[PDB]
Amino acid sequence: RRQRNPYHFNSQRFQTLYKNRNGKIRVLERFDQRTNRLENLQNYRIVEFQSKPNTLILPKHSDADYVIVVLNGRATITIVNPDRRQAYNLEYGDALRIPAGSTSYILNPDDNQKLRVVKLAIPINNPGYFYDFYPSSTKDQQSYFSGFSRNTLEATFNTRYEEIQRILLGNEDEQEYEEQRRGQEQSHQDEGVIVRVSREQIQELTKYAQSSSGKDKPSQSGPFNLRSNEPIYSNKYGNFYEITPDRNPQVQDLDISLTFTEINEGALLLPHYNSKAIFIVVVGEGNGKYELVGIRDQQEPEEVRRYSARLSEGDIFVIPAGYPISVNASSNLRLLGFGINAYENQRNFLAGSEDNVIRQLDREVKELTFPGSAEDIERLIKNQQQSYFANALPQQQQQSE
Amino acid sequence: RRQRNPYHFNSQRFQTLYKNRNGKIRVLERFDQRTNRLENLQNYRIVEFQSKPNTLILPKHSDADYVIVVLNGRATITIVNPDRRQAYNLEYGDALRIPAGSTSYILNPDDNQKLRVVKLAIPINNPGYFYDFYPSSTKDQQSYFSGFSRNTLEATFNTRYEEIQRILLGNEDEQEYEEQRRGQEQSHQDEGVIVRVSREQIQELTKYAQSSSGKDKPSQSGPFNLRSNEPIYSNKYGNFYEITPDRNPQVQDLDISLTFTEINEGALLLPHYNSKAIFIVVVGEGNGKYELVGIRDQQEPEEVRRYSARLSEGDIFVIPAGYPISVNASSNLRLLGFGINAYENQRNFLAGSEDNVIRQLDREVKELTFPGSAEDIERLIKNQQQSYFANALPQQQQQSE
Amino acid sequence: RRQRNPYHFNSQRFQTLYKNRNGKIRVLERFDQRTNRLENLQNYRIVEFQSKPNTLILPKHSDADYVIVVLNGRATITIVNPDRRQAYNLEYGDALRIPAGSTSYILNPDDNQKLRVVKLAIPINNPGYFYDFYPSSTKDQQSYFSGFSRNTLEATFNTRYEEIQRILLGNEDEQEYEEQRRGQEQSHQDEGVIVRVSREQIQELTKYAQSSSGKDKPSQSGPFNLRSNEPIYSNKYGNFYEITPDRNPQVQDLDISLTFTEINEGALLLPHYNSKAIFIVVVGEGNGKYELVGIRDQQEPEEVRRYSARLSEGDIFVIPAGYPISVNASSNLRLLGFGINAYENQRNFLAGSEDNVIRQLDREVKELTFPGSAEDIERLIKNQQQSYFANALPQQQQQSE
Ligand SMILES: [K+]
Ligand SMILES: [K+]
Ligand SMILES: [K+]
Ligand code: NA
Ligand code: NA
Ligand code: NA
DSSP states (O other): SSOOOEEEOOOGGGEEEEHHHHEEEEEEOTTTTSSOOOOOOOOOEEEEEESSSSEEEOOOOOOOOOOOEEEEOOOOEEEEEOOOOEEEEEETTEEEETTTOOEEEEEEEEOOOOOOEEEEEEEEEHHBBEEEOOOOOSSSSSGGGGGOHHHHHHHHHHHHHHHHIIIIOOOOOOOOOOOOOOOOOBBTTTSSSSSEEOOHHHHHHHHBOOOOSSSSSSSSSSEEETTOOOEEEEOOOOOOEEEEEGGGGTTTTTOOOOEEEEOOEEEEEEEEEEESOEEEEEEEOEEEEEEEEEHHHHHHHHOOOEEEEETTTOOOEEOOOTTOEEEOOOEEEEEEEEEEEEOOOOOOEEESSSSBBBTSSSSHHHHHHHSSHHHHHHHHHTOOOOSSSOOOOOOOSSSOO | OOOOOTEEOOOOGGGEEEEEESSEEEEETTSSSSOOSOOOOOSSEEEEEEOOOEEEEBEESSSEEEEEEESSEEEEEEEEEOOOEEEEOOOOEEEEEEOTOOOEEEEEOOOSSOOEEEEEEEEESSSTTEEEOOSSOOOSSGGGGGGSOHHHHHHTTTHHHHOOOOOOOOOOOOOOOOOOOOOSSBBBBBSSSSSEEOOHHHHHHTTTTTTOOOOOOOSSSOOTTSSSSSSSSTTTTTTEEOOOOOGEEETTTTTEEEHHHHHHETTTEEEEEESSOEEEEEEEEEOEEEEEEEEEEOOOOOOOEEEEEEEEEEOOOEOOOOEEEEEOOOSSSSEEEETTTTTTTTTTEEEESSSSSTTTTHHHHHHHHSSSSSHHHHHHHHHHHSSSSEEOOOOOOSSSS | OOOTTTTTEEEEEEEEEEEEESSEEEEEEOOTTSOOOOOOOOEEEEEEEESSEEEEOOEESSEEEEEEEEEEEEEEEEOOOOSSSSEEETTTTTTEETTTTTTEEEEEOOOOOOEEEEEEEEEEEEETBEEEOOOOSSBBBGGGGGGHHHHHHHHHTTHHHHHHIIIIIIOOOOOOOOOOOOOOOTTTTTSSSEEEHEEEEEEEHTOOOBBOSSOSSSSSSSOOTTTTOOOSSTTTTTTEEEGGGGGOTTTTTTTTTTEEEOOOTTTEEEEESSSSSSSEEEEEEEEEEEEEEEOOOOOBOOOOEEEEEETTTEEEEEEEEOEEEEEOOOSOOEEEEETTOOOTEEEEEOOSSSSSSSTSSSSSHHHSSSSSSHHEEEHHHEEEESSSSSEEEOOSSSSSS
């Protein structure tokens, strides 16, 4: 539409990196592609990863940090080190920092639930770009071991290339059949990087795992549910959870807050602005619209600019620091918030009866600030008795189907 | 002149953002406009803001940090939060960090003194660019509330748009008279973002205010006078004050030192270099010349480069780390220094008899370093018995008017 | 060769900045010249500095930090401050942070040993660019004092320009003879910035110096030998030393680890990857080859990319975080490692029997990960009983000369 939305990143702007019959691994366009208004976010990327019941992403390490949030189902994740090796179950809500270089792999042990993970990634080397290192050799990726010379591999493993090749790599087989339809496996596990897993294996693999279930609190060891603490804002229109970095060792070096806002249908996250935090917002569920307010630099009276977009499962949108936002709900809307620059943030609501900086003004300034009489503004301001969330005067039925 | 001055930012390179009859709000060209030698300063901007007696900037928040220094007069500043609301008087000399997102507004309660504020700003979102958010609706800026849809505003305030509009915004009135001359007000306060204020109001507004007067010391709460501590360098040619970040909680996260150098007429801030700190220097008062020394990369003997410029009330100039500087005074010259990267800085004077790194040399190296005999250099070096500042052999009168 | 090596910086890509008959001062091309894959290293530069016995670099300060490592011989370094003045002997192995702005100069007191220093530099002002400030006036560089005006110099030193000029600078002499051959001196010390020194002087100059000899431990005061601690990895194929930033006050603000890997002939630093650290690797001695593994983004099965290069005294190469590396040795190969982003790094070996993350995998995942049976992989993996370094099945003789 005339006057576009730089800050809106619909579902579609995910580029598939990897689809096989067991899961997908999408990544979102670089925040600074079309826009040049989102430069401070040049490093961050958003990955959605998805898998089907009883499945396994093969071991991977990346040149990037990861903050996992399970927006759907269960997974055991394992994280492997030079020294120890770990494993956590993770339920809906759970988040987890995978540091940069950790060998990890994620199993979906559920029997009928797809796994849905959304990852913020912070590249280490180059800005907006990381890569996935697999030891596995599939028809889809090769091992890094392949990038070594036979001599080097042979010294390395202390083994005839022919034995390495047979065991770690794979042999010459340069044709094709790849037709006919049913389902089974390939090589050993449904070929590719996302493979089908046996219960035998799920049982073995989960047996080590540190169970979540109980909503674990932001520590430095295991997963932490974004609903662990009591809502920060809670009433009968929604819930607002949030873990600020300073109270969360696992990410405090990344200076990320994480939020989980549930907006009930016909409800409205009343307008606020984030004082220093740039928020990357992720739709898990529901439908709605938002209104972000900017000053159109463009290039008489300084014009403000609404940047609106419909919302739905999968979309990303971004909230620049200082920019007032508000968010509707046609259907029960659930949002995941990655707040960059979040340490010391303060969310300033602009309506209703808490953290309302407009009311916190000096009487006589309200006076000078708005055309109404002082008293008219206290009354008006006070007409919204709900805080944080309210009713949005929703649409409904009447002579309608 | 042939061989320009990248580092000099005369008064003129201020772009007005806002002039009405009550004050101005200028901002300085981005440090990396013409030059590409000033990249590390790409984020910082310098705002001068000015107002006339009994006046008020309307409430504003920005997507940027602010370090205020009052180079002229008095002001009450208020800073408003989701929770509390504060207010300080500020006299000449006082500085104050306005964090990013703080609702603030500045009154000039004086009866005949113009208020002069110089702000370093550090944008949060985008590099070299911030914006001003006002709830006010004037003939000059609109409210961010205007960027919301009527439906959204109506849910928000819990009020008929028509009542919001009447009280918080303003109504349709699409013509003009804007002629005839006298002075009074407009709407309620002299229209625009800088408005005329009543004593009734000044009295009320200042009644909360935490008075400065007494030269408050670098804390984390209120304003701090850049002359609070005893001069760091003081003799009969000038005074050199400076608050390093590590001894100043309010900015220590920004890693800014602030200086206040008064150079007496015909005096001379002897040549030094800042070891890590990049200094942004601001002329409050007086006239003089400076000499900055660089190595002209250009593109036989490596050539050095003087970058000189006359000085006067309002000018900015910048001192790259490591680059030797010296500053004259035709008239009593008063400078405000924003030292970026200032934590652990050490100012190395190169003449006179303190912090003189040339004299700190090994005898026998002086020997090898300069053409003179060792003894000739100790004597010479020692011919300047004043430290830090000295006499500049000024110009004066003789058969002259 | 088709498919170039961005990460390889042979000896040749050093640009001489300064050669006279007493030493050279080379600097390496900006890590982001040809490549745009090395952006996070845009600031760092590598300087090799070399001098001949009984010599002196004249006093210099830079707008950049320095981490010195002596890869050959001995030096006294002096570091001069506004306040105190210091001096350390430094033997092979020793490293030292010269902060930004420290007046320093380096003497080579040895009688027959050339001094070889390799410096990582981190510019302060501009990214990839620093400059050298000398008070000396040679036929090669001028003093910064020259960049001041006569009036300014005269106030400064409190001396007739004609006396300054005679003692600190040098006088007009605008011709040439610069022929005939023997050796002696010029002006006072072999002209230029690197000069010939007397024993009389070496004796005097070293008399202050804090002797190294004993392998001093990472403190915050003096030089620290990169072999101070016991090897981190040691067996009969090499030694691997490393000082991580958190255990080394002098650099912990720079977040640099330093390594010293000695690979014995026919030995092999087995393949690993650095989890967060980007390593800048410097060849002191020996010959060999390396294999770095990357994912060629390029632009069916994701291709990996070997980036190989022969090695020899002087070469630089770089190891991106996460990228597996391995290094051979034709001759006793000695490497200096500048690990950027090194705080919390963990080196993951991929072969042999320590810190082997492949073996740390879950049995049943190895199962799914490689084509071999689980048991075949444990056996194979276990066929390399040496850790860290091993034998490379080297080349040798047979019907050969
Ligand atoms: K929010
Ligand atoms: K200064
Ligand atoms: K290494
Ligand atoms: Na063997
Ligand atoms: Na109502
Ligand atoms: Na005199």
